[PDB]
Amino acid sequence: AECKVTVDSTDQMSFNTKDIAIDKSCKTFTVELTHSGSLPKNVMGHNLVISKEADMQPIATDGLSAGIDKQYLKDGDARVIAHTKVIGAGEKDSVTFDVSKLAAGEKYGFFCSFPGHISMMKGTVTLK
Amino acid sequence: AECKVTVDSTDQMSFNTKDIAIDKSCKTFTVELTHSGSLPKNVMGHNLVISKEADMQPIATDGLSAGIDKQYLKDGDARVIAHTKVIGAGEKDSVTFDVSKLAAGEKYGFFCSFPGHISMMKGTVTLK
Ligand SMILES: [Cu+2]
Ligand SMILES: [Cu+2]
Ligand SMILES: [Zn+2]
Ligand SMILES: [Zn+2]
Ligand SMILES: [Zn+2]
Ligand SMILES: [Zn+2]
């Protein structure tokens, strides 16, 4: 199986994809996030966070007050299945998680939790 | 006296001035803000906020939770002297305030409180 994907994020507040396909055959899956462009992380930082589709906005709202030091995520948030750091231009991060965590028949999505980015920066996770 | 100034804001996350000079003789001062370029407000929205220089970042941090519907400013934040709405490309807005609110000898600045913009979008307010 192919159990890795790389997603780019930009100065114009977008990801380069709207769906991440995860082979159910995979034991673990690795998401690598890169940031093209020139803006630093405190201006236009992006992370990639995976959760239940219905949990994305609640997580993002709870992340606002956490600050960039905690990757704009509330510490110990149980709704977060996996997430990268907040990265700025020229940086990259990756996260590897157990594919078992994704309940078949449940709807999953990815988003950026930097304040206000979720409106433009989200997508679906599809198990294949 | 001249008691009005126009400031433009860009897709490049910049104001087209670094200083706003306010004549002390003015009873009121009016700041008009425009937005050139083509990006919508949820991507590259800008407002213009006036406060004490030391207060700019705390105000901006507090504004994160207020959201774009509240112009990214906490309601009733007493540290805010004056502010425009958040505007997107092709829009404009203006604010008029009493110049007596400026204490000569105190240092004032202007900035944009849209998430992440402040480090790239701020300047001084100079009384003349
Ligand atoms: Cu982002
Ligand atoms: Cu701005
Ligand atoms: Zn909560
Ligand atoms: Zn974490
Ligand atoms: Zn004068
Ligand atoms: Zn107000």
**Structure-token pair, residue B48:** 């213009």
Contacting residues for A69 by C-beta, under 8 A, at least 6 apart: none
Closest ligand (CA of B77)? 6
Q: Nearest by CB to A64, which of B39, B43, B65?
A: B65
Residue A70's alpha-carbon distances to A66, A67, A124, B51, in angstroms, are 6, 6, 24, 28
Cross-strand partners of A22: A127
CA distance A124 to B28: 51
- Nearest-Cα distance to chain B for A8, in Å, is 17
CA R_g for chain A: 14
- Å resolution of this model? 1.6
How many other CB atoms sit within 10 Å of the CB of residue A12?
Answer: 14
CA distance A39 to A46: 11
Which structural domain, as residue segments, surrounds residue B103? 1-128
Number of domains in chain A: 1
Which residue of chain B has the CA closest to A121? B43
CA distance A49 to A83: 4
CA distance A65 to A60: 10
Way the structure was solved:
X-ray
CA distance A123 to A79: 17
Residue A84's alpha-carbon distances to A33, A91, A92, A98, B63, in angstroms, are 8, 12, 9, 15, 25
CATH number of residue B99's parent domain: 2.60.40.420
